[PDB]
Amino acid sequence: HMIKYYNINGQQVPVENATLHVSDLSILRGYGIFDYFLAREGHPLFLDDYLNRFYRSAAELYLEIPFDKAELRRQIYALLQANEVREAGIRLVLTGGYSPDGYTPVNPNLLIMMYDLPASAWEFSAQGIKIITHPFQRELPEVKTINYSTGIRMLKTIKERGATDLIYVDQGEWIRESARSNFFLVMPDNTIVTADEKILWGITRRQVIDAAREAGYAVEERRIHITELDQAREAFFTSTIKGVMAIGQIDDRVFGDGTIGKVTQELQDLFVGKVKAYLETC
Amino acid sequence: HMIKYYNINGQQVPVENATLHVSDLSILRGYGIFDYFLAREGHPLFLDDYLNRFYRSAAELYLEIPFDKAELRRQIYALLQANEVREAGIRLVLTGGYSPDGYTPVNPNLLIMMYDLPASAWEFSAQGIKIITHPFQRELPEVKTINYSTGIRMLKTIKERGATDLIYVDQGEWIRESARSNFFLVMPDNTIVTADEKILWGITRRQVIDAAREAGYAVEERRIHITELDQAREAFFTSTIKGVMAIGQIDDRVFGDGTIGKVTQELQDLFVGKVKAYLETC
Ligand SMILES: *Cc1c(COP(=O)(O)O)cnc(C)c1O
Ligand SMILES: *Cc1c(COP(=O)(O)O)cnc(C)c1O
Structure with missing residues (x-):
């Protein structure tokens, strides 16, 4: 129920070990795309729409997501299961990757992070x-x-x-x-x-x-x-x-x-x- | 002579262990400043000018550099010494830090990276x-x-x-x-x-x-x-x-x-x- 794992480049990793090497172009160059979506009752909301956006964002930066959308969708479901949660926030990040020269992208780093359902979500204050x-x-x-x-x-x-x-x-x-x-x-x-x-x-x-x-x-x-x-x-x-x-x-x-x-x-x-x-x- | 160390938050670290946790706002939000300067004969060039710029960049993002400029200058000289190099490239990065909420900065992460003198530096092609x-x-x-x-x-x-x-x-x-x-x-x-x-x-x-x-x-x-x-x-x-x-x-x-x-x-x-x-x- 507390978040135990993230996924980096298709590998489940304990949260306390979820790091990137400092040559990553998001760190050096802010080069990256992301997506963020809620999950309720064990389901990410409107998932295909968020994933199709994520794929469209990646292509605009000429960054290839290493997995096709079915494979990424599986990894997201596996991560919800492994953290044993039904209510969550989910962040996808795709960075420019570990660049040789601190500028030219090579292959991207893919992150799947997971959070409690934000407290304020759909607060709907009057x-x-x-x-x-x-x-x-x-x-x-x-x-x-x-x-x-x-x-x-x-x-x-x-x-x-x-x-x-x-x-x-x-x-x-x-x-x-x-x-x-x-x-x-x-x-x-x-x-x-x-x-x-x-x-x-x-x-x-x-x-x-x-x-x-x-x-x-x-x-x-x-x-x-x-x-x-x-x-x-x-x-x-x-x-x-x-x-x-x-x-x-x-x-x-x-x-x-x-x-x-x-x-x-x-x-x-x-x-x-x-x-x-x-x-x-x- | 090959680069053996970086410095993260005032600690020398072997290059192979130089990581940030994925909650860092440079990774999530591209929130960061940097500076980059050459060193020749064991001296960073025009150093006070690059450092004063670095401090001015930090204040524009409301990011406090944890060390005063004398202390940062010492760490840079110590890092050149520890890598045993006279000719180098030097990158300072100051990120938004490990943010609780993936948006609000808390305390920044400071990186001092070091490279061989770029091969092309002052090529001066005709x-x-x-x-x-x-x-x-x-x-x-x-x-x-x-x-x-x-x-x-x-x-x-x-x-x-x-x-x-x-x-x-x-x-x-x-x-x-x-x-x-x-x-x-x-x-x-x-x-x-x-x-x-x-x-x-x-x-x-x-x-x-x-x-x-x-x-x-x-x-x-x-x-x-x-x-x-x-x-x-x-x-x-x-x-x-x-x-x-x-x-x-x-x-x-x-x-x-x-x-x-x-x-x-x-x-x-x-x-x-x-x-x-x-x-x-x-
Ligand atoms: C993420 C984002 C939104 C919100 O998009 P949703 O898919 O509705 O969450 C709006 N504007 C900007 C600039 C954003 O980055
Ligand atoms: C770093 C940089 C420069 C070059 O500044 P120098 O101090 O001469 O290296 C020029 N323009 C932009 C946008 C830069 O980021």
């Missing part, structure tokens, strides 16, 4: 969070790279300023995403708005959009002007750990009374239904 | 290299972060296209630097031009500028338009390993007959003199 705008555009935004400098560097500024997250705004004209979350507005006519370009295409994002459309809501995937914050009734984040999370304040703009909006609340319940349905196919 | 333009702007450009995704990802494209390096061009309007080098033009009136903003402030760059000014050349530190490639007689790179390196072709623009330009050649000899002078102070 009180929206408070975030700040930050001018920035992520590099290679469509690839899930290991590159979180700006997001991490900003943690002092976020806290200093009374916030618990931020939203990136490309040349401070275009709303994108947080470091770790996709961003949605709900207009007063109940139209759901989210960025279509220069973002990471979240799996959670995909499930909430599909669930919104199935419930008969209008969803626009489009460029979002900074000024549309002024027109929106609601704002929320999506991610693997957040599920759907109500944002109550961006800078001095309070959405409603700061509590979770109507459509936001309906989208939380639909996401929990997307998960329940997923688990019934396993 | 034949200029061939590079391509690439549209891109480095994140946090003034900090020497471990984030080289774009530069590394581009290696296939560079080689495919008949090149051995690139030059980054900010919104393809403004000339900046390569992934690993500063970039200079020499105008037909012998004015030396280099970017002043949104670049890493190289140590080599600093020494070549000082040496050019002392020789009585005009040096402009200014924004450089893409179209000024058309006006330049010469182009060169600077970096710790290149020293000064002649660029003979950018895309279909051949500088002269592709061989090292006049001022470029004089700046190579002045840099070797900057190094010789440095070593006489040790």
Whole structure:
């Protein structure tokens, strides 16, 4: 039940022995991709979608995953079994590998790490969070790279300023995403708005959009002007750990009374239904 | 003489045992800074300047280096001594450390790695290299972060296209630097031009500028338009390993007959003199 093992390059290894040699290009060059997904009732959620993303991220960095997707899926199931857990967080990392020259990739290092189910997962607080705008555009935004400098560097500024997250705004004209979350507005006519370009295409994002459309809501995937914050009734984040999370304040703009909006609340319940349905196919 | 040891968190460690645990934020989040400098005759070159840069990079990521600069300088000298080498490459890495939550830094991991003197160091080929333009702007450009995704990802494209390096061009309007080098033009009136903003402030760059000014050349530190490639007689790179390196072709623009330009050649000899002078102070 406590996590006893990780997997490095297809070998189960006690957590206390899970190391990389310092020639690894993630350490020297931040060259890497990753994926992160929850497991509930002994099943990684929406697994084929997270794995297909992981394979697409690897090909963008010209990094070959040593195992095909069936073989990686087996190793993930074997690791859940070996740690004897049903509720977990799971991280896949694929690094540039042990490079001869501290720059050119050779063969990648593959890591499968495992965590308790995050405590906050799908908390679904009724009180929206408070975030700040930050001018920035992520590099290679469509690839899930290991590159979180700006997001991490900003943690002092976020806290200093009374916030618990931020939203990136490309040349401070275009709303994108947080470091770790996709961003949605709900207009007063109940139209759901989210960025279509220069973002990471979240799996959670995909499930909430599909669930919104199935419930008969209008969803626009489009460029979002900074000024549309002024027109929106609601704002929320999506991610693997957040599920759907109500944002109550961006800078001095309070959405409603700061509590979770109507459509936001309906989208939380639909996401929990997307998960329940997923688990019934396993 | 072969490298026997690295230093991790103030402890000398055999190279074969130099590892980090996979919770290190450089591995999970590419959160890190580094520095790299040569040693000749048993002395790291321009050391105080590289160390002051290393300390400035750390403070930008809010990462405290555990030792003051005198103590780090001692550890570097002790490591050269223990490996019994006079000619070396030296890498300092400071990672986000072993984070509890795979995101928030706690205390950093400090690495001192050591290499043979790179074979190519200050090669000073008379034949200029061939590079391509690439549209891109480095994140946090003034900090020497471990984030080289774009530069590394581009290696296939560079080689495919008949090149051995690139030059980054900010919104393809403004000339900046390569992934690993500063970039200079020499105008037909012998004015030396280099970017002043949104670049890493190289140590080599600093020494070549000082040496050019002392020789009585005009040096402009200014924004450089893409179209000024058309006006330049010469182009060169600077970096710790290149020293000064002649660029003979950018895309279909051949500088002269592709061989090292006049001022470029004089700046190579002045840099070797900057190094010789440095070593006489040790
Ligand atoms: C991981 C990540 C997300 C969330 O994607 P999910 O698949 O929903 O967890 C969003 N944006 C960025 C930048 C991310 O790295
Ligand atoms: C390290 C580096 C340089 C070169 O700096 P030097 O101190 O001259 O080696 C140039 N540009 C970038 C982006 C670098 O990381």
